[PDB]
């Protein structure tokens, strides 16, 4: 005769049983009986595991996930919360991976110039910049243009957003400006750099946020992010927010990556420098590349540094003493792009090639090549997906099956300047018939 093993077994044992079932089976079980429903909804592990299995969160990001879900659903419990999150996630991933699924497209006007120089995507805000010395802010939820920010006397080329609707910019205008989307104005104008601001990043140390800007003047000025508004500071010495200049590079500071009191910069002098912003001193000088660096990443988690040079190579450095760890050779052209996914180190080159290495041991995980061999202009990645763009090409790749999901979604685009995605929303600054546009794709 039968026996409701699930009800009769000790709680712990039944849960092992459920951990051997795919989510679909777990949902059906939830409707088998009142007790099954109760037993399953009692588990937090059940869903925590799944979320991680599907790469919707990582052990480190767990807690933060929880806090955010609790803010989203006060009256829900941790268990039911995690389940809502998973069910919501697994279905967006289902859409992304479905060849027969087509995202909803929204196309908005871009800048006066056909080229977009930069793009941020956070807090339901899509901010874009261009050589038309303008900054456009968009609404990613209602899919529409919000406002424009004007001020820079030169084309904008670097912009980083900061929680609260605050964002910082840098331009050929040689100034570093802080804006307030809410108020829609430039609340600060930091002068100093004796040349174009080429890159920038914002790091936080001891609950204090700092702005780090690299320039073609070979230096990196450090300013603290501020707590009639157009407050200009013609002089660094008198500027309360100024901190100092990191001198060391002999050429333009092309890239910058930081976290906490550690920032890493890449220059055209073919070198990289690890700075301790707190002590405002040089920590290590990474030498070896035989040509200019176009991108670097500071892997704080692992305490390392990835560098991409025009010398066609990628280098991994140990920031525990500054010595080289490995040299990756998977590109025959200039390697100007890099991203660190929770599971992958992804790199793209001027020959249209894209490589994915294991984020910890750097063994070859995947590699793609745009069919028309054109240089990779942009791309973004998650543990489940890769979106890449080049002239006449915009591709989405399912990183699990390794196969290409969609290849014609933005076919009418002539250039994919910047691409960024998060959850069910994908965004791209593109060019169509000598004009820029913002493309927003919906996968919900």
């Amino acid at each position: 005769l039968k026996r409701d093993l699930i009800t009769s077994l000790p709680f712990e044992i039944s849960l092992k049983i459920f951990n051997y079932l795919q989510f679909e089976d777990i949902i059906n079980s939830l409707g088998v009986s009142q007790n099954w429903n109760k037993i399953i909804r009692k588990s937090t592990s059940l869903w925590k595991k799944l979320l991680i299995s599907e790469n919707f969160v990582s052990p480190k990001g767990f807690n933060s996930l929880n806090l955010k879900l609790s803010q989203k659903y006060p009256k829900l419990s941790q268990q039911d919360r995690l389940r809502l999150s998973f069910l919501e996630n697994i279905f967006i991933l289902k859409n992304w991976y479905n060849p027969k699924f087509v995202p909803q497209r929204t196309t908005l006007r871009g800048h006066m110039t056909s080229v977009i120089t930069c793009l941020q995507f956070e807090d339901n805000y899509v901010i874009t910049g261009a050589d038309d010395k303008m900054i456009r802010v968009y609404d990613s939820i209602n899919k529409k243009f919000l406002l424009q920010l004007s001020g820079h006397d030169g084309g904008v080329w670097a912009l980083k957003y900061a929680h609260g609707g605050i964002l910082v910019s840098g331009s050929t205008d040689r100034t570093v400006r802080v804006w307030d989307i809410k108020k829609g104005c430039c609340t600060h104008v930091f002068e100093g750099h004796n040349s174009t601001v080429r890159c920038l990043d914002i790091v936080e140390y001891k609950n204090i946020k700092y702005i780090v800007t690299g320039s073609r003047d070979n230096t990196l000025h450090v300013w603290k992010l501020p707590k009639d508004y157009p407050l200009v500071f013609h002089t660094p010495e008198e500027n309360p927010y100024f901190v100092g200049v990191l001198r060391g590079h002999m050429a333009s500071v092309r890239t910058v990556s930081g976290h906490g009191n550690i920032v890493v910069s890449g220059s055209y002098d073919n070198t990289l420098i690890v700075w301790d912003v707190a002590q405002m001193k040089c920590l290590y000088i990474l030498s070896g590349h035989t040509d200019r660096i176009y991108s670097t990443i500071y892997d704080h988690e692992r305490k390392r540094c990835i560098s991409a040079s025009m010398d066609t190579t990628i280098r991994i450095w140990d920031l525990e003493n500054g010595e080289l760890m490995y040299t990756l050779q998977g590109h025959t052209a200039l390697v100007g792009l890099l991203r660190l996914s929770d599971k992958f180190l992804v790199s793209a080159a001027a020959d249209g090639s894209i490589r994915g290495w294991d984020a910890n041991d750097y063994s070859r995980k995947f590699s793609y090549h745009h069919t028309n061999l054109s240089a990779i202009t942009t791309f973004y990645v998650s543990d489940n997906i890769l979106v890449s763009g080049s002239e006449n090409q915009f591709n989405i790749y399912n990183l699990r099956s390794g196969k290409l999901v969609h290849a014609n979604i933005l076919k009418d685009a002539d250039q994919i300047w910047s691409v960024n995605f998060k959850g069910k929303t994908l965004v791209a600054a593109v060019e169509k018939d000598g004009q820029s546009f913002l493309e927003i794709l919906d996968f919900s």
Binding site: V115, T117, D131, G155, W157, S171, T172, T196, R198
Partner: peptide, 4 residues
């Protein structure tokens, strides 16, 4: 993409 370099600035003018």
């Amino acid at each position: 993409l370099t600035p003018p």
